[PDB]
Design a protein around this ligand. Structure first.
Ligand SMILES: C[C@@]1(c2cccc(NC(=O)c3ccc(Br)cn3)c2)COCC(N)=N1
Length: 379
């Protein structure tokens, strides 16, 4: 695994990517690591924001599947053609596999200027693959063709950013303390269950099904912690109360505006810690992961504003359920244990902390109320 350490790069707020090769002879591309989708999709035609792209005419091993694919997102969309080809991860496991590839021929608001990635590696399950669940995702092909163990782990390290994707195992050098596991509720997204939320120690006191309306997922391809409307409004109220010694524009709380302080003077202590309690592997047991403001107040690098440190509020409202994005994942080592249908969390070797508070993963906690917190009926 040591050879896989530090194999992720990126720019803050732009996405963590890993180097891959496609085709024969191999064409190198940087690929966004995305646990919230299930297609391997790469730019395959020129684009102003792309420095390079997949040139299929140069790959003898490309096979056309003679099928188009159209993928709209809330923001942005792309269109392309399906095929298969040989794929490798130079700083991953030492194998080459044949995998499905969506060649992106047209796109809108998909590629990001200066992000330095040219495609996306969807690491979730076939159920949410496009055009449908018959298109085998990359990691499924990897496991079937190489018998590398059916799990991977992600260590995303915040501020240029970096990290590690360990394919096929767990690297103990990347975390401290204990690994705590929460069950994968359903294999489509990496869906999990949140059973309690506290902000600076104070329970939001909602029916726990609200936390998972209509699902909660772990998503390396989303920046923010995204929360259902009801939970979001409660969270903002609590954070506002905690930080009330300073008043910020409403635009800040909507993520429409930055807040800035003179470089080095950010008042971290007036912002509360957020604790997310995740369902444990035993009935009505849970553990919590705790989030510092250094995680949910994201610095926006800009030379023009650099007399100051300026931040975006990286918690936002969702109508599609909770998303535990990078602001949650950064500073933790997150194990996607597909074989045992569970997600593990531990404190990352590259964790967030000032001299007063430290991000944590800890437990066990017990709850009397026997209610299932899943928004849908369990199976
Ligand atoms: C396919 C989809 C998608 C499409 C295009 C770009 C992205 N991600 C990013 O640009 C990005 C930026 C910063 C950080 Br930290 C993580 N990711 C994600 C749709 O949105 C949800 C999802 N998980 N994947």
């Amino acid at each position: 695994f040591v050879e896989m350490v530090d194999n992720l790069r990126g720019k803050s707020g732009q996405g963590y990517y890993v180097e891959m090769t496609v085709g024969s002879p191999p064409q190198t591309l940087n690929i966004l690591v995305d646990t919230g989708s299930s297609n391997f999709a790469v730019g395959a035609a020129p684009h102003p924001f792309l420095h390079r792209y997949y040139q299929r005419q140069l790959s003898s091993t490309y096979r056309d599947l003679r099928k188009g694919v159209y993928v709209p997102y809330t923001q942005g969309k792309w269109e392309g053609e399906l095929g298969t080809d040989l794929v490798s991860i130079p700083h991953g496991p030492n194998v080459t596999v044949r995998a499905n590839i969506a060649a992106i021929t047209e796109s809108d608001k998909f590629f990001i200027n200066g992000s330095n990635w040219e495609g996306i590696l969807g690491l979730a399950y076939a159920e949410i693959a496009r055009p449908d669940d018959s298109l085998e995702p990359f990691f499924d092909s990897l496991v079937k063709q190489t018998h590398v163990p059916n799990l991977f782990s992600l260590q995303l390290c915040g501020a240029s950013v970096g990290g590690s994707m360990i394919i096929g195992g767990i690297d103990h050098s990347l975390y401290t303390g204990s690994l705590w596991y929460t069950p994968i509720r359903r294999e489509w997204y990496y869906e999990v269950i949140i059973v309690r939320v506290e902000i600076n120690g104070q329970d939001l006191k909602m029916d726990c099904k609200e936390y998972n309306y209509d699902k909660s997922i772990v998503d390396s391809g989303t920046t923010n912690l995204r929360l259902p409307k009801k939970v979001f409004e409660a969270a903002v109220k609590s954070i506002k109360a905690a930080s009330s010694t300073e008043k910020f524009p409403d635009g800040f709380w909507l993520g429409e505006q930055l807040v800035c302080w003179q470089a080095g003077t950010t008042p971290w202590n007036i912002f509360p810690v957020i604790s997310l309690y995740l369902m444990g592997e035993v009935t009505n047991q849970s553990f919590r992961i705790t989030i510092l403001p250094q995680q949910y107040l994201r610095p926006v690098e800009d030379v023009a504003t650099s007399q100051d440190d300026c931040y975006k509020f990286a918690i936002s409202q969702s109508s599609t359920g909770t998303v535990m994005g990078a602001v949650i994942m950064e500073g933790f080592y997150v194990v996607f244990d597909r074989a045992r249908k569970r997600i593990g969390f531990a404190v990352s070797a590259c964790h967030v902390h000032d001299e007063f508070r430290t991000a944590a993963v800890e437990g066990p906690f017990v709850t009397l109320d026997m209610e299932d917190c899943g928004y849908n009926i369990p199976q």
